[PDB]
Design a protein around this ligand. Sequence first.
Ligand SMILES: Nc1ncnc2c1ncn2[C@@H]1O[C@H](COP(=O)(O)OP(=O)(O)NP(=O)(O)O)[C@@H](O)[C@H]1O
Ligand SMILES: [Mg+2]
Length: 301
Amino acid sequence: MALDVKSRAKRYEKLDFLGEGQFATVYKARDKNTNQIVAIKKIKLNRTALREIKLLQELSHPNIIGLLDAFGHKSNISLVFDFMETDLEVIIKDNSLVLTPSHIKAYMLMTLQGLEYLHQHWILHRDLKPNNLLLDENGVLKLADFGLAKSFGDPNRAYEHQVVTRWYRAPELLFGARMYGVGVDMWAVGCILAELLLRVPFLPGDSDLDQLTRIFETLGTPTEEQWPDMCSLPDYVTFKSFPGIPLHHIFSAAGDDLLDLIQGLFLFNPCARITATQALKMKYFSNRPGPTPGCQLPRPN
Ligand SMILES: Nc1ncnc2c1ncn2[C@@H]1O[C@H](COP(=O)(O)OP(=O)(O)NP(=O)(O)O)[C@@H](O)[C@H]1O
Ligand SMILES: [Mg+2]
């Protein structure tokens, strides 16, 4: 809209290009108004899109990214976020970094406190994956992105990187469910935990059928008893029956406390899948070792 987006915002001054995403070009800028540093996502081109932008501005939580401003004229709109040093994806992929139990517990704690707030305010992230868990210089993790750019943007023609979103995608979504809830985010959270523990993607499927295959050969083929009404899913498909791999054989260093969390995040029935509040009350987070304070979490140099 002309009257709901500012056309100009002269207060931002570009510094350096950061990188190409699927739906945006991101770059580094200084707000001349506060001397602060920001990242601006530039999106090429709608009542709903503006409502989504406004809502995420109105959110306030330590582990949710700040969307600080929005501006743009005709074929473009630009979103101004808190500048974040790194993310869980570069942390995971960095061979120089050692991931202790305390490191992993901290990343999870912060993620789940973010989700809890979102889900408390009746909002689904819908796009959780490592590169959307951002990390500031002081070790604060923030949920970011929210697929805002996807929601209304033309695709980025210069995006050369691998599209990975299906790896974090819950089975009710792969089987075409039209109604869904917090289980969507909880499942991704489990896949992210798995990727912190294994340092590689847990279920890297290369198509939607191969993703379901991978899910079932790893976690087992579910029955309508574990998952009532599964076979009424729109795109439901019958697979080779698989027994699954015991979680303790996958996660060979995990204690019963962490395996309990992982099982809860990966329950097939999306009604039974553990919620963010329940996850945070699990013995895993009251148990030693306790989580690493932000200032001691490993930084990629
Ligand atoms: N708040 C931020 N601070 C610093 N860098 C960021 C921030 N947001 C995105 N980036 C960088 O921008 C690049 C990718 O953009 P990002 O938007 O994260 O890609 P995406 O997950 O494909 N989502 P989108 O671009 O909205 O389609 C990466 O090089 C990120 O490090
Ligand atoms: Mg992103």
